Design an enzyme around this catalytic site. Structure first.
Site: not given
Ligand SMILES: *N1=C2C(=O)[N]C(=O)N=C2N([C][C]([O])[C]([O])[C]([O])[C]OP([O])(=O)OP([O])(=O)O[C][C]2O[C](N3[C]=NC4=C3N=[C]N=C4[N])[C]([O])[C]2[O])C2=[C]C([C])=C([C])[C]=C21
Ligand SMILES: *N1=C2C(=O)[N]C(=O)N=C2N([C][C]([O])[C]([O])[C]([O])[C]OP([O])(=O)OP([O])(=O)O[C][C]2O[C](N3[C]=NC4=C3N=[C]N=C4[N])[C]([O])[C]2[O])C2=[C]C([C])=C([C])[C]=C21
Lengths: 299, 289
Positions: A139, A190
Site C-alpha cells: 500500500d 493498483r
C-alpha cells in the site's frame, strides 16, 4: 488553525471527530450499540472473522483483499509482532480455493525505524507467500515514503519475487514519472486517487485534476499492457474505464475494480455479474476503532 | 444561458447589423481583422510586434458548388502568395468543406494539393481544421494521402470530446503529425462524444500529455486557465522545451494572457479570421461569454 483568512475547516472537522471518538463514553457506546454498522466495514477483530467475510464475498462472486489492522508500529519489537500477524494470515490463506491477496503498509514493518528492517521482514513475508500463491500489495503511504516504497518493490522484484504489487496515487505530480520509470518491471498496479493530506507543492489541490490524472494514468497503464486494479468508488471514473476498455478491446483478464468492504456493495456485485474482476478490501484486527475513526475523520 | 439566446436572437435583425457595422467597429475589430487580406496582414503585423504569432483564417459563405469551392481555393492562394516573404511565421487554417469535401473527396484533395504546392516552397504552414464527426474519416484520409505524397507543412486538429480521438491519435503516430488539440466545437450526441465537461477536460489533458510523451509537436488551442496552468506545470516538470509545443487562442480572446505567455518565452498564436462573411462568426464570439 486558519487557512487564507478563514478557519481551516478540514482541520476543525478532523479535530472534532478525533475528540468525540476519543471520549471513553462514545467508544463504549459504539462498541455496544453499533456492532452491525461496524461489521459492514470491518470483518471483525479476528483472522477467523476475516476469512469468513472473504468466503461470504466469494459466494457472491466478489474476491477479497485481507488487510490486517494494528496499532501504529513504533519499535522493532512491534514491527516483528505485526509481521507475525501477517505470517498467520499467509499461512491461513494457503489452502483456500479462491484468489489470495493481502495488503500491508511498510511503516507497520518498521520502515520509519529502518528501511533495512522493513525489507528483511517483508522478504520473509514474500518467502512464505509466493510458493503459497498469496499476492502481497505494498500500500502507498504519504509522499515522504514513496521513494523508499518504490526502492523496496524494485529490490524484491530483482531478487526474483513476482507475487508483489504496488499502489500509485493519481494526486501526486510525481506519479506519471514513477509509472514510466517502473515500466521495465512490468508492475502489477493498483491505482488510487490518494488518501493523505499533501501540500499543493506535491499534489494537485483540484479534485477535477486529481480525477483527470486518475483517468490519464489508468489509460496510459492499460495501453502499456500492465495489469491495473482500479481502486475507486467514483461512478464517473468507473463508467469511463468500462467504456474505454470496451472500445479499446482490452480483455477483462487484464484489469479489475477494487472497493472498500461495505462501500457500494450493490455496485461490487453488479460489476461482478457483468463479468469484471472485482475485489473488496477487507480490514480486520483489534485496532478497528482508531482505524474507523480516521476513515470518518477524513472527508 | 439566457444571455446566449438574447444575443443570437437580436443579432439577426438588419438594423442591428447596420448599427454594429457603423457604430461598433471597435468591437468588430477585436475579433476579426476585417473584410480584406490587406487588413488580415496588418493584424498579423500588430500581433508580431507583441511577440504573438498569427494564424490566418479566410471566412467565406458556405461552399455549395464546385464553382464556389474553386473560388474559395483562389482566396486561399491569394493569401499564400501574399504571405510569401513576410519575415515572420506563416500559418493558414482551412475547413475542407470550403474546398468542396461534401461535393467530392477527389475535388477537395485536388484543390488542397494545389494550395500545398504553392504553400510549401513559400514556407507557409497549412492546418486542416476539424469539422463535425461525420467528416473526420475523410479529413484523415486526405491528410494521410498528402503526407504519403511527400507534403510535410500540413497539420491536423484533433478534438478531445470524441471517444474516437485517442485511437485516431495512436493510428496517426507513424505520420509524426503536427497536431492542434482542441476541446471540440460541434453539437455531438452522447454516442460519439463525452456529454460531461469534466470528461472533455480530462481527455484534453490525457491526449495532450500522450502526444508530448510521444514527441509530437502539439499546439494547445484552448483558453482554459486550468488546462493552461496544468500544461505549463507538466512541460516544466518533464523538461519539455518550449520549442516542442505552443498555445493558440482566438483573436481578441484573453489577449493579455497571449502577451503574458509570449513574455514568458512560450510560442503563442492568435487565430485571426478575415473575409466578407465575418458577421455570423462575430455573433458566436459575443454569445459565447
Ligand atoms: N489503499 C490506498 C493506498 O495504498 N494509498 C492511498 O493513498 N489511498 C488508498 N486508498 C484510498 C483512495 O486513495 C481513496 O481515498 C478512496 O478510494 C476514495 O476515492 P474514490 O472513491 O476514488 O473517489 P472520491 O473519494 O472522489 O469519491 C467520488 C465518488 O465516489 C463515491 N464514493 C466514494 N466514497 C464513497 C462513495 N460512495 C458511497 N460511500 C463512500 N464511502 C461517491 O459517489 C463520490 O462522490 C485505497 C482505496 C481502495 C479502494 C483500496 C482497495 C486500497 C486503498
Ligand atoms: N478550430 C477548431 C477546430 O478545427 N475544430 C473544432 O471543433 N473546434 C475548434 N476550435 C474551438 C474549440 O474546440 C473550442 O470550442 C474553444 O477553444 C473553446 O474551448 P476552450 O477555450 O478550450 O474551453 P472552454 O470553452 O470550456 O472554456 C473554459 C474556460 O476557458 C476560458 N474561456 C473560454 N472562452 C472564453 C474564455 N475566457 C474569456 N473569453 C472567452 N470567450 C474561461 O475561463 C472558461 O472557464 C478552435 C479553437 C482555437 C483556439 C483554434 C486556434 C482553432 C479552433
Amino acid at each position: 488553525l486558519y487557512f487564507q483568512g478563514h478557519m481551516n475547516l478540514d482541520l476543525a472537522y478532523r479535530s472534532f471527530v478525533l475528540g468525540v471518538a476519543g471520549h471513553p463514553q462514545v467508544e463504549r457506546l459504539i462498541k455496544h450499540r453499533a456492532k452491525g454498522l461496524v461489521r459492514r466495514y470491518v470483518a471483525g477483530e479476528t483472522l477467523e472473522e476475516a476469512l469468513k467475510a472473504a468466503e461470504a464475498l466469494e459466494r457472491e462472486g466478489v474476491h477479497a483483499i485481507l488487510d490486517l489492522l494494528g496499532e501504529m508500529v513504533r519499535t522493532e519489537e512491534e514491527a516483528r509482532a505485526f509481521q507475525r500477524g501477517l505470517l498467520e494470515l499467509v499461512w491461513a490463506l494457503a489452502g483456500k480455493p479462491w484468489p489470495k491477496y493481502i495488503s500491508l503498509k511498510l511503516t507497520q514493518l518498521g520502515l520509519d525505524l529502518s528501511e533495512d528492517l522493513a525489507l528483511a521482514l517483508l522478504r520473509e513475508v514474500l518467502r512464505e507467500a509466493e510458493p503459497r500463491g498469496v499476492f502481497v500489495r505494498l500500500d502507498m503511504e504519504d509522499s515522504p515514503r514513496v521513494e523508499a516504497t518504490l526502492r523496496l518493490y524494485r529490490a524484491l522484484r530483482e531478487e526474483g519475487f513476482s507475487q508483489v504489487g504496488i499502489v500509485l496515487q493519481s494526486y501526486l505530480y510525481r506519479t506519471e514519472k514513477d509509472l514510466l520509470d517502473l515500466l521495465p518491471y512490468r508492475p502489477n498496479l493498483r491505482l488510487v486517487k490518494g488518501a493523505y493530506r499533501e501540500p499543493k507543492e506535491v499534489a494537485f489541490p483540484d479534485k477535477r485534476l486529481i480525477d483527470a490524472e486518475y483517468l490519464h494514468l489508468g489509460k496510459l497503464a492499460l495501453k502499456e499492457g500492465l495489469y491495473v486494479a482500479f481502486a475507486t468508488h467514483d461512478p464517473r471514473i468507473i463508467a469511463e474505464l468500462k467504456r474505454y476498455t470496451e472500445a479499446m478491446g482490452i480483455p477483462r483478464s487484464r484489469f479489475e475494480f477494487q472497493f472498500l468492504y461495505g462501500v457500494r456493495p450493490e455496485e461490487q456485485r453488479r460489476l461482478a455479474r457483468e463479468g469484471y474482476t472485482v475485489r473488496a478490501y477487507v480490514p480486520y484486527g483489534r485496532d478497528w476503532y482508531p482505524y474507523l475513526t480516521r476513515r470518518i475523520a477524513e472527508r
